[PDB]
Design a binder for this molecule. Structure first.
Ligand SMILES: Cc1cc2nc3c(=O)[nH]c(=O)nc-3n(C[C@H](O)[C@H](O)[C@H](O)COP(=O)(O)OP(=O)(O)OC[C@H]3O[C@@H](n4cnc5c(N)ncnc54)[C@H](O)[C@@H]3O)c2cc1C
Ligand SMILES: Cc1cc2nc3c(=O)[nH]c(=O)nc-3n(C[C@H](O)[C@H](O)[C@H](O)COP(=O)(O)OP(=O)(O)OC[C@H]3O[C@@H](n4cnc5c(N)ncnc54)[C@H](O)[C@@H]3O)c2cc1C
Ligand code: HEM
Ligand code: HEM
Ligand code: HEM
Ligand code: HEM
Ligand code: HEM
Ligand code: HEM
Ligand code: HEM
Ligand code: HEM
Lengths: 564, 564
């Protein structure tokens, strides 16, 4: 049966990874520290010859057992989102098991509740993305004992794969760049982008506290020195790492290290599956499904929901937004709405609950945002048989409908070498192995599985139209580059679910509200699981900002509630 | 063996009720004209020496075959809402058949769209309660041809069982009674009653056009001369018929007669099951499932949803508001959220979709509101065993939530002959056969299934609480009557779903909006189907006013868009 555990046991024992009596904690702490002990850290293992490099990624320092298993078929976690063509990992002949996280067993839940709290905290934070890390750290600082839980193999959720930094007003970076900005303009900018549906109270707090938010992250050792402009802002105010990381990885690396530094132990592989209410409507705890320990209840005086959005819950999205039910997503697979479901079930109200944001051109074969600027700098779009079907400079909204009305509900973004050399993010997508390349159009058509006739018709027309400056087919406003210079490229795209603006109802101090719109006793929330900060439309930079400002507000108010 | 049809054919022939070739229309028009020919209209069938009067009810002038059936078990339609105790109707051994309206047949819907329109109109109005009749009459006044369809046996929906009139500001009834009122007061009162969530623009139009709507109904013959104050209103603004009918029956009686005078006939037993959109995102008609004719498509330049709320759709309620899933409802059985489901399915957005208003003590058998003034004037509330479980003067949301925590999720409201003799409202319940009664407290307990010992203990404890003026079980502050004078009475109650404030998003011209919150071409809506007028809580009198004001705006913009 050969196992990775048996490969090592044969040369040693079980204790070489396990404690004496074997007892794998849910985080698999002990077993991972072992691997580090004999194989070194990631830096030790980093290659650089390797194209992708499992040991040196934007994921940061996670558990080795995220991919390598003790006793079952290995996982190459990267291809949860990427589509890296990889050869079998070591020990990939081990047995296959279904995931441990199989749903909600309601009788084992009932059992856990009736047994009573098997352990007790002050503040339990559910979810270790940026909101959950901000919440646990704010709580800690106010004196409270904290338990931080996440159901995933590592930390970071959607936060860790974010791109366009954090919005703030009234910072150092802005002064340095000359930029004038006022709190009011930040509010106005967010109220406007959200179609005026956003809770002005919440937007006011976001705007206010955002400067101090950046400074806070800075205090823990993050650089947010790149200052820039994003869609919907009248003035430069999105901060980003000076010259290293994407923001998502910078911010998550810093909060993890901070959390470790204050002795907040995250528990990984631990899914809160029920909020526990006593006979007077107070949340008094939660049931956790632990990967190894199974079902237990944690009593807590305060519970903070920090679980992220619901973009990957197919049943939620079909019920809220049936016209999006055949979209992909850009999300981490963690974003299955658990927190909205648990709050809803005990009688919380929601705000804007069905408001979902999608992106028109998400990689079909690898879930990565294909920037709209690719279309903007010349790229052509085309359906599965190689035919155009709308201006490329249409609206996000129109592009998705357009795409979802095509064969296979996908399209190809398509361009030549002039675009390739003019746009580095297209060579990014190429580095990620996302492009179909073809040295003739006809070669391109056969790789992509388009129809040569049709694709040939299109480019001739497109060149025709770029020559004339007159898109007579689909009206493309402007065409800055044509399709002639050889190597021709293709990327498979389709509209994807991106952030769910709706969620749990919250007041300004991050209590979750009940059906009378009153604070539920013991229950707090922060980040994407919450509604009302973004109205009907989140802007670039506002969601990470929300996770920091209301993350900290929720953990502080949680600890106050558990202290007195 | 027989049925009514064969009993009559034996005396006459098939043609006694049916045309020659048997071709029964959806509305059963011809057959019901024949009932009245031979048997007389309701004024002639009416008795006066008769407890209920199936032939002279607040339902007003409806088809005989609402109840009497040709070829199946008769329906005493009264008992969809009431629970009168009656001997089997004539022909009661005819064959039991399932409702004709068996859900949606996707394959037959597909066929009717593939086939294209069977008939065409300018304005299709789906739903003939107040909002759809008003939309129909305004579309006909504006000069459009109109089809009005309703899936039920008779028209009127919830609107016809409405109780507590129509809010308006600036009427001649206010000037006759010395009542000063201002549009801004109406506006603020609504905004406050909605927890400040109402679309302020819809509220302003509601306020501004409310007197004109009362006047409009009065031009058609309605009486709304009585002026009273309703909950949340700061002055008296609620208009009801002087004496005579309740406001629901008055209003729907008046709109039925005016739609028949202008030549708009309602098509009955015609359920709209899909809105048909072309390829430019335009609504162009709708598939109708007619009881006799089956599935067919009506093409139309404008379609007005006036289908009412979703309080009797159990799946929608359990999804949006699971802690309300075990409530009853006071609604007519027509209120199944169809208009919202069909709208959602083609990409309409929603407003406050999940916001559901309930009433604390709706009858569990006869689904009528037991007024809180029953408890105000003395009655006691006891669970299925016969134990009190909360003060009868708590707030409404506390009373619903404590009833839902009792065994069986219902309670009994209990009182003796002193209350009965002092409150003509409970004598009305008695005439509706809603009261259980016992010569002694033990007989009452045996009739209702309470425990004899628990009820008798409750009655001596509570009588001792009235002799000391102090209720040591529950704190009721005011105990005006004990239970010592026989007969003793009870009514069975449970909180009920009553109104769904959320629904289809709308603009000020009553276009339904898409996911960019722009008007869908061809599609309009009015009444409870729509979300936004009431924010998080409807005030008494405002929803009837909403069906008039926006029903007339929807029908006028529908017609304008069809002609043009
Ligand atoms: C590709 C991408 C790029 C983005 N870029 C930006 C950007 O540039 N700017 C911006 O402002 N926003 C952006 N966003 C949106 C923003 O990143 C997300 O809204 C935000 O980071 C989510 O923060 P969070 O803390 O609420 O949740 P998340 O980071 O999603 O994390 C929640 C965590 O809760 C855990 N959890 C969930 N359910 C349970 C349970 N039952 N028990 C225990 N733990 C649980 C999860 O496993 C996860 O780790 C982007 C989103 C994506 C997908
Ligand atoms: C008992 C009670 C008393 C009330 N009293 C008051 C009051 O006094 N004042 C007040 O302001 N509010 C009151 N309300 C609320 C107000 O009565 C209702 O919100 C308002 O009447 C709803 O009107 P409507 O025209 O939107 O819908 P409705 O009157 O419900 O009518 C909708 C019509 O659409 C038909 N329909 C539904 N689906 C379809 C389909 N697929 N195809 C064809 N037809 C379809 C239905 O069969 C129906 O007849 C009361 C509610 C209740 C239950
Ligand atoms: C979960 C914990 C661990 C994981 C995931 C892990 C991972 C691996 C993998 C993937 C291989 C084979 C790779 C290949 O095909 O070359 C391997 C081999 C090996 N492991 Fe581990 N390891 C773990 C713990 C340990 C420990 C605790 C020890 C020592 C006590 C150890 C010592 C070795 C050695 C000596 C080999 C063969 C290495 C060589 O000579 O190249 N490992 N391990
Ligand atoms: C500190 C953590 C980890 C340790 C110690 C570890 C250990 C190892 C070792 C020892 C090998 C073989 C190299 C050798 O012969 O020494 C290996 C290969 C591999 N590991 Fe890891 N692993 C870790 C984490 C991860 C993670 C987080 C991932 C994915 C996200 C991953 C994916 C892989 C893959 C795909 C291979 C085979 C790659 C190749 O072809 O070179 N491992 N690992
Ligand atoms: C005969 C020797 C061993 C025995 C009997 C053993 C037994 C176990 C048991 C009983 C569990 C947990 C089941 C649960 O909680 O659901 C486990 C998990 C685990 N063990 Fe072992 N173990 C042995 C050796 C090893 C070795 C040598 C390694 C590392 C190379 C290892 C790595 C792991 C890992 C990573 C886990 C979580 C596992 C997975 O994903 O497959 N074990 N082991
Ligand atoms: C060890 C595993 C992984 C490796 C080696 C890897 C590799 C890479 C590389 C080389 C890039 C381009 C440079 C960058 O922007 O950092 C990238 C980008 C990205 N990866 Fe990963 N990835 C891994 C796992 C994941 C996972 C698990 C997710 C999601 C949960 C993910 C989502 C993304 C996203 C969204 C981007 C940005 C695309 C863009 O904006 O251009 N990756 N990854
Ligand atoms: C032997 C004589 C008769 C025959 C063969 C006959 C046939 C039918 C048929 C074929 C339908 C259509 C059902 C559908 O769409 O599935 C129908 C409906 C109906 N018929 Fe008759 N009919 C007869 C006599 C009568 C008479 C005399 C009456 C009235 C007293 C009557 C009243 C009705 C009504 C009210 C309906 C609608 C459905 C119902 O209420 O059962 N029919 N009939
Ligand atoms: C669907 C349409 C009709 C309905 C609902 C209806 C109703 C009824 C009912 C309920 C009865 C039995 C009454 C009892 O049990 O006391 C009855 C009997 C009778 N009906 Fe109809 N009827 C309809 C159409 C007609 C028409 C068109 C005629 C004449 C052509 C007619 C003539 C009679 C007669 C003569 C009797 C026997 C009454 C007697 O001799 O005492 N009905 N009808
Ligand atoms: C104009 C319309 C209707 C006609 C012609 C009609 C006809 C009749 C007739 C002929 C009878 C037998 C006794 C009598 O002759 O009065 C009867 C009894 C009855 N009808 Fe109707 N009916 C009509 C509408 C309705 C409706 C809409 C309902 C239910 C709300 C209904 C329910 C009853 C009941 C319960 C009885 C038995 C009452 C008794 O014991 O006499 N009918 N009807
Ligand atoms: C022929 C059929 C029916 C008869 C004979 C009947 C009888 C009555 C009577 C006698 C009243 C009291 C006087 C009044 O308020 O008008 C009443 C009220 C009422 N009925 Fe009906 N009913 C019928 C059908 C229905 C239906 C089908 C519904 C629901 C869709 C309904 C719902 C109500 C409501 C909500 C009230 C007001 C109760 C109150 O506030 O006291 N009834 N009905």
């Amino acid at each position: 049966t050969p196992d990775m555990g048996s490969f090592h046991a044969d040369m040693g024992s079980c204790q070489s990874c396990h404690a004496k009596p074997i007892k794998v904690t849910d985080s698999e702490t002990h077993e991972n520290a072992q691997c580090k002990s004999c194989h070194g850290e990631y830096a030790e293992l980093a290659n650089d010859k390797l194209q992708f490099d499992p040991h040196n990624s934007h994921l940061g320092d996670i558990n080795c057992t995220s991919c390598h298993k003790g006793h079952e078929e290995p996982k190459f976690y990267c291809n949860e989102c990427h589509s890296f063509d990889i050869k079998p990992m070591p020990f990939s002949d081990a047995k296959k098991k279904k995931s441990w996280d199989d749903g909600w067993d309601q009788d084992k839940i009932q059992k856990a509740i009736a047994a009573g709290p098997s352990e007790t905290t002050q503040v339990l934070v559910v979810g270790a993305g940026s909101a959950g890390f901000n919440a646990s750290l704010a709580a800690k600082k106010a004196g409270a004992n904290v338990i931080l839980v996440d159901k995933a193999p590592f930390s970071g959720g959607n936060s860790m794969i974010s791109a366009g930094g954090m919005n703030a007003v009234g910072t150092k970076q802005q002064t340095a760049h000359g930029v004038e900005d006022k709190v009011e303009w930040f509010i106005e900018d967010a109220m406007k982008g959200g179609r005026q549906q956003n809770d002005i109270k919440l937007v006011t707090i976001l705007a206010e506290q955002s400067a101090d938010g950046v400074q806070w992250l800075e205090s823990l050792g993050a650089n947010l020195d790149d200052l820039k402009r994003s869609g919907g802002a009248r003035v430069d105010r999105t901060h980003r790492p000076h010259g290293g990381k994407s923001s998502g990885p910078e911010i998550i690396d810093t909060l993890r290290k901070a959390a470790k530094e204050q002795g907040i132990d995250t528990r990984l592989n631990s899914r809160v599956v029920k909020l526990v209410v006593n006979d007077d409507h107070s949340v008094v705890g939660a049931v956790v499904h632990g990967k190894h320990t199974g079902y237990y209840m944690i009593g807590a005086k305060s519970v903070v929901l920090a679980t992220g959005g619901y973009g990957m819950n197919k049943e939620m999205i079909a019920y809220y937004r049936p016209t999006m039910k055949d979209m992909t997503s850009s999300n981490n697979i963690t974003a299955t709405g658990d927190g909205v479901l648990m709050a809803k079930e005990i009688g919380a109200s929601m705000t804007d609950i069905d408001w979902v944001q999608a992106h028109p051109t998400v990689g079909k074969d690898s879930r990565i945002l294909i920037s709209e600027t690719v279309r903007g700098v010349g790229a052509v779009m085309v359906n599965k048989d190689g035919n155009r079907f709308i201006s490329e400079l249409t609206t996000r909204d129109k592009a998705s409908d357009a795409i979802l009305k095509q064969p296979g509900q996908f399209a190809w973004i398509i361009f030549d070498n002039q675009l390739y050399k003019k746009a580095k993010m297209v060579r990014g997508y190429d580095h990620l192995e996302m492009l179909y390349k073809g040295d003739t159009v006809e070669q391109l058509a056969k790789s992509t599985g388009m129809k040569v006739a049709d694709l040939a018709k299109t480019v001739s027309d497109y060149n025709g139209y770029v020559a004339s400056g007159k898109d007579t087919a689909f009206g493309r406003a402007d065409m800055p580059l044509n399709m002639t210079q050889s190597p021709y490229y293709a990327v498979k795209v389709a509209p994807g679910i991106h952030h769910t603006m709706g969620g749990v109802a919250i007041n300004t101090t991050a209590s979750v509200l009940d059906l009378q719109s009153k604070p539920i006793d013991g229950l707090f929330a922060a980040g994407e699981v919450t509604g009302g900060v973004h109205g009907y439309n989140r802007l670039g930079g506002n969601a990470i900002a929300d996770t920091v400002v209301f993350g900290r507000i929720a953990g502080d108010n949680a600890a106050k509630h558990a202290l007195d």
